[PDB]
Design a protein around this ligand. Structure first.
Ligand SMILES: CC(C)CCC[C@@H](C)[C@H]1CC[C@H]2[C@@H]3CC=C4C[C@@H](O)CC[C@]4(C)[C@H]3CC[C@]12C
Length: 39
């Protein structure tokens, strides 16, 4: 059934966790070293 997966997508805590992961995955991009490739 597609109803079970639909409820999780349109949830209150699931959409917050995926949103805080997006703004935290960006910080992983800013911390990279551009000079030393092998670090
Ligand atoms: C968890 C991620 C996505 C957000 C936090 C990222 C920052 C705060 C973390 C990610 C990897 C970490 C680095 C991993 C390895 C080292 C080498 C060590 O000799 C000095 C600290 C240093 C340089 C860490 C500093 C903190 C660091 C840059």
């Amino acid at each position: 059934i597609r109803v079970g997966c639909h409820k999780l997508i349109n949830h209150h805590i699931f959409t917050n966790l995926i949103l805080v992961f997006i703004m935290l995955s960006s910080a992983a991009l800013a911390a990279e070293d551009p000079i030393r490739s092998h670090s």
